[PDB]
Amino acid sequence: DPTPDQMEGPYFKPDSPPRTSLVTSSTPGVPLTVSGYVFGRACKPLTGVLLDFWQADTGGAYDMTGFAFRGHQFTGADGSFTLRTIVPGLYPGRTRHIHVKAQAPGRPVLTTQLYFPGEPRNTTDALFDPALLMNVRSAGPGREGTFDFVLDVA
């Protein structure tokens, strides 16, 4: 079933730098890598799909002046994507989430959000959707997330 679309929210910024790492070795926060595939119709892993991510910092704050915690990549030849970041903090009124825009070559933009398992605000945030839940395990110093996007596209 194709990845549901959700609100952009207040804090998107166009023209994000191309980067698969949103942090450095001095960024505050609990380490988090989100990786997975983008599939199209009929389980075809999709190549060259744009993935533009953005999230709050460890304290729950979005960077409107710069491009902190903003960065986009393109899925590899085998369909995989990889995002190195830290766990975002709770912005007031929202459950923990990371935003993403996904765009297959020449198709319209999918704007959506990824959620974390076992967040208490999942009971109360109306935007929370199980289809958008990442799988998260505790690898090493920080946490590893996985999610597959499914795009209605051949």
Query: Which stretches of the chain bind Fe ion, using CB under 5 A?
Result: 9
* DSSP secondary structure of 128-142: --GGGBPEEE--TTS
Looking only at the bridges linking them, the beta strands covering 143-146 and 31-39 are parallel
> Is 72 flagged in the annotation as binding?
no
> In terms of CB distance, is 47 or 111 closer to Fe ion?
111
Q: Which range touches Cl ion (CB under 5 A), out of 16-24, 38-46, 97-105, 115-123? A: 115-123
* CB distance 49 to 77 below 8 Å: no
**Interacting stretch for Cl ion, rule CB under 5 A, among 11-19, 32-40, 97-105, 111-119?**
111-119
62 is in an annotated binding site: yes
Q: How far is CA 4 from CA 34, 62, 64, 103, in A?
A: 18, 23, 26, 13
Show contacts with Cl ion in window 116-145 (CB under 5 A). Answer: 117, 122
Q: List the structure tokens of 7.
A: 């609100």
CA 78 to chain centre: 19
Min. distance of Cβ 97 from Fe ion in angstroms? 5
CB-nearer residue toward Cl ion: 68 or 127: 127
Decide whether 111 or 122 has the Cβ nearer to Cl ion. Answer: 122
Distance CA 101, CA 53 (A): 7
The verdict on whether residue 97 carries a ligand-binding annotation is yes
In the complex, minimum distance from the CB of residue 118 to Cl ion, in angstroms, rounded to a whole number = 5
Which residue ranges are tagged as binding site for Fe(3+)? 62, 91, 97, 99
